[PDB]
Write a protein that binds this ligand. Structure first.
Ligand SMILES: [Mg+2]
Ligand SMILES: [Mg+2]
Ligand SMILES: [Mg+2]
Ligand SMILES: [Mg+2]
Ligand SMILES: [Mn+2]
Ligand SMILES: [Mn+2]
Ligand SMILES: [Mn+2]
Ligand SMILES: [Mn+2]
Ligand SMILES: [Mn+2]
Ligand SMILES: [Mn+2]
Ligand SMILES: [Mn+2]
Ligand SMILES: [Mn+2]
Ligand code: NA
Ligand code: NA
Ligand code: NA
Ligand code: NA
Ligand code: NA
Ligand code: NA
Ligand code: NA
Ligand code: NA
Lengths: 387, 387, 387, 387
């Protein structure tokens, strides 16, 4: 039951199942995986595709001949399995040169190098068929207040993204960008810390239509925010270009638990929203099998990501299709929320005594919302305990 | 020393010093204050002005004659003291009718009433000389996932703000709106939970130039975010129309401590930013003297808000003026951060071997940022311990 | 299905279903309930009993004749329904006199009054048959560092609890005390902020056997802690005298959501632990129907508390009884965790080359824990998705 | 000014200034330091001593001859500088064998090895003159609920500490143990997550007098707790055997900022408490110079730890010595808090009409606490802004 197929568009980063287990306090617990191995194992589990940072696929500093051979082997694995590559990204965070940032490093020479490294990988992403190019500015930020003038940093960040937009336009590429917010870690505070900040920034770019967000479940939860709500705002803005699915237990370091772990009810409401809205992008997992696990546990954890999505999809669909739930949604006036407040216009509203002088505030205040009954129907559907 | 004068534009809400001390678990500890008393006492402390919700100035449900008398007494107090009223707002959160929201209540009749209540108070705000009209949507949100369709709620929120913009335009008013984000409390999650989300929303309004943000120190800190960073993004966007100053100890219920309490170093960096950027708006305190205090403690707490701002202003100015700090800022390449990455343009960057083939990444990575020395100069200046 | 019966020992505070809906920003949305009404309605839902603060049952300041009549009516309702009263507590937080604390108020006269108020209610609790007397020191703490010397406050808190222990011993009462930790709210920081701090404090009382803890789900989660882990430590110490069940979404103000809401997987692991350990005390709900609800929603929310406990009980029992789970627990070495490390004793351990010189650390490190497979079996059982 | 001397007992872990800068997302930015270098540089800054994990001083897996040479070189550096070694600890977290724990690993063979590794290092610590042996169980815990039975784990943790106590007693050593709590990171939840939980656990050991706590500023702040309050409870219990000083910005990953950074006012209240209580132990820094820094920044950051302690010590002493502050403390009844509530005894309290029938609750409730004036005096003293 709940068996994923490529139809479900489940994708995984090479760096997810390939995470060797090094953490702030501990050495690697697993050997490195050949990307070819990961492609073949993920395909066997029913994944649709993979994603990569440049330096996951091509060791940093590789010669041109080494680069070609790494890409050739990877493409053979994709061809052997039918796996796709819908998204790629740049590693602008691991190498020591990026310790103060890539696009917003205080050192101008580093900013220029970061752009050149990204541009090289955009070309590769396009060659592999990627539709989306993600940017996670994990080193953009500060540990201290004097170190980073945030207005100047935002100017540099806009300049960088504008140059990248000029680049893809000039080459006729169809790829679009997706900015991944995170509030902190590895920097004390990261620039563009939430979906909202990233959405706001995009509106100030020269070609805003080329940019959207890549929100990650656990990153919004690291600020204690409601991930489904943030996804709804991204959808409302037309900017949900990609998504990273995982789990997180609240305000901690980024745990990258398998999807469904962490906040299970938020996972339910997320799947309900994505499916109801008709989100058509990849269901991408940015997760880490815990370092306690051997390779059998790696593949079990990856399989669990997909299984949990599919269970939640079933339960959310049953919730929305249940005539008792539909009745409860009307009892709670969800239908009214979707109607305009004043399609009659401002003057009619100003002239409407029912909106002021003749509005019975105490009668309105007496009406219960019936939200608890609705939420218990939702709980019963999630748990398969209807009756 | 540190004596405030009206020149400093320090303002206070009537509801701040007037808070009677009722909390989730406890009854009022102080009697209600007449707004006339608060105006006269705040003026004696060196405040510049006050702000109000409609229902702070005019008891909810007052007749027209009662409304006139309350306003007349208040205006006499303002005239007697020279106090100004730069900002006003609507109470769309206390009355039970607003239990599911004002502008985004599921019930359409409540949404229409909320708009009419706001419009009435915009007229009053203009008559009192206010330049800014704040909106804090404290009831906009949910405790459960099925209760609020966030895309529909954002449609209703946009409709409401668009109608308000149409209203002020039609009346020829110069007032502008400032949206106050908060992540949670009193709702389980509040819509537009951070500065970023509010900035992003504004960009989708029909007349975006009429709307900015009113960020509150403690509200961003309730999501664990860096308040100075968020203020920098608001300034970068041209949207810092007003600000609420207070203190908060991290991720808790909204404490509304006096300014300077809570995160003292964030208060330092905030004042440094506001003064460096030339922010010209009110320095408004949205705080609550703790319910442990009698009226002498109320006025001491209000005086402390202003005193702490003035101490921090002195220390931040001394930091920026110190030739040793200026040297340290250059050592940390803050000057380079302010220079364009590629004013030479995209093609020149692509052709520049110094940005890629000839970039010595290991030499760049070896350069220290010297951020710790800079931050210890900042600490020494804050504490008055230079030497 | 999942129908509670008095056998299940589900109990509710009068103040839970009786919460009128006043919050930091909003007036009451529901009328006050007569305790007689609450007893009869809860009995109809299958509750076993209720609990009370003194001032929930007897209005503060009541005369002796008024006190007798309130108690008489309440006892008739209990007799009419078969409901029990297993626990009572003192309100040492609502009245303004307690603004700086009860037992740890700086003012000695208030500390003495707090003790006398508690003692009067202990007598009543015993007359009503209560086995446990809870103390929630919600006002014990501070908003500022100079206001409360914590060593002195702990001396006063120990003195108070020691006097209460002397009192019950002198009267021959069988009741025991349960201290309820909370980290913050309504004070900026509350003394004894977690289960651990309360357990440690109890060990320093003169008669430690008379005192245990009353942990609350949401309170430990307000510090981001693992509630099942804290309950395990309380059980390990023999100190889980009572428990408060509810839901919470992480590090926020105390939400008091119905049980099962908030962190659903933590609720699952909690029920698994309580049932596995054979906890025999009340399953008490300290929750608040949201102020959006009318009385039908109040009773729906209370029913949901019990329903969710019973669903989780079923799923946890099925998890533990599943031979595939039992196999996975052995694969993960949960059986070994329960065996002594060195029942052979210290000298044998020191002499055992297999524990040092001949321990193959790399072979040990290669063994996977298989925790992900185990956790996905747990998820499948929780969701009823085995297959 | 503020120049540290060995008199001040400032100590640093080898792993602090020696941190190479590897984080969850980034490679090392600094070369490894020879412990001899660190001893000599720290001595030049005015440190009193260093501390070590076994594997900081002796590379894991070293032969007996290699171990002797590493220790010999280290002791020569200590002799050359006058530096002391007051504390040592075991690394039971870096090596992959410890991925599920040391003392509470599910695998019994790992638990036995962990004990043998610790015992070997206790012998070395004693030879180097250490008075305290710290245990930070960073791998004791879980990412999932089924993986770790916490009651069984606490049994194993007690068994391990009891064996260590038997060991030191049998050898006649004067060293004592200090348990370091942390709430999470690197495990999803860590056992003994706070000072309170550790204090409570110690009370159940066979020889409780041999064990205390080593609280770390940032670790308690990772649960949003008040670090000075927790230190006060440890002092009240007689269990503050050692302390780790650093900075933290709230509920995040463990930042290990230099002391004084992070929550500056909490640092002030901590120093006030340690000095007022006469804490006589090391002022030990467990911090990490940010990976942005070169070695000059490492030494600047270490110097800043000590400087900030000394500034805060001066300001707290001036606060306590100021006759205006002493008056304000009496106005706030801090003197009364230190007096017994009922030295007259229980019967006298029960018979005292002034404690109940004749207690004027409204007159008591009207008295203000004057805490805001007191706290503003504290702020003025911290900032050197008295006047
Ligand atoms: Mg619709
Ligand atoms: Mg500039
Ligand atoms: Mg057992
Ligand atoms: Mg004393
Ligand atoms: Mn992540
Ligand atoms: Mn991601
Ligand atoms: Mn606030
Ligand atoms: Mn505000
Ligand atoms: Mn609670
Ligand atoms: Mn409770
Ligand atoms: Mn730490
Ligand atoms: Mn430490
Ligand atoms: Na700039
Ligand atoms: Na979209
Ligand atoms: Na709509
Ligand atoms: Na602006
Ligand atoms: Na005392
Ligand atoms: Na127990
Ligand atoms: Na055991
Ligand atoms: Na001590």
């Amino acid at each position: 039951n709940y068996a994923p197929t490529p139809v479900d568009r489940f994708t995984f980063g090479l760096w997810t199942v390939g995470w060797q287990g090094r953490d702030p306090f501990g050495d690697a617990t697993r050997r490195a995986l050949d990307p070819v191995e990961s492609v073949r194992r993920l395909a066997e589990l029913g994944a649709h595709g993979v994603t990569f940072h440049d330096d996951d696929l091509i060791p940093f500093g590789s010669s041109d001949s080494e680069r070609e051979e790494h890409v050739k082997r990877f493409r053979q694995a994709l061809d052997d399995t039918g796996m796709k590559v819908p998204m790629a990204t740049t590693n602008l965070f691991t190498h020591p040169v990026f310790k103060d940032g890539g696009f917003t490093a205080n050192d101008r020479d580093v900013r220029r190098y970061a752009l050149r490294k990204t541009i090289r990988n955009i070309d590769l992403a396009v060659e592999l068929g990627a539709e989306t190019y993600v940017a996670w500015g994990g080193r953009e930020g500060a540990e201290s207040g004097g170190a980073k003038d945030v207005r100047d940093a935002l100017d540099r960040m806009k300049e960088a993204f504008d140059l990248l937009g000029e680049y893809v336009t000039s080459q006729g590429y169809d790829i679009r960008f997706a900015i991944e917010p995170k509030p902190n870690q590895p920097r004390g505070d990261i620039l563009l810390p939430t979906v909202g900040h990233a959405l706001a920034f995009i509106e100030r770019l020269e070609r805003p239509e080329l940019y959207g967000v890549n929100p990650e479940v656990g990153h919004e939860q690291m600020a204690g925010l409601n991930f489904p709500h943030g996804i709804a705002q991204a959808l409302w803005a037309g900017k949900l270009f990609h998504i990273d699915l995982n789990g997180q237990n609240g305000i901690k370091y980024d745990q990258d638990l398998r999807f469904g772990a962490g906040d299970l009810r938020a996972a339910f409401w997320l799947v309900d929203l994505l499916e109801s809205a008709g989100y058509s992008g990849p269901r991408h997992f940015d997760f880490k099998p815990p370092r306690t696990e051997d390779f059998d546990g790696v593949w079990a954890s990856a399989a669990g990501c997909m299984r949990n999505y599919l269970i939640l999809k079933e339960r959310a669909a049953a919730f929305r299709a249940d005539p008792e739930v539909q009745e409860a949604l009307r009892a709670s006036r969800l239908d009214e929320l979707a109607r305009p407040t004043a399609a009659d216009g401002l003057q009619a509203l100003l002239d409407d005594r029912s909106a002021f002088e003749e509005f019975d505030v105490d009668a309105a205040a007496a009406r219960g919302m019936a939200f608890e009954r609705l939420d218990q129907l939702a709980m019963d559907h999630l748990l398969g305990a209807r009756g």
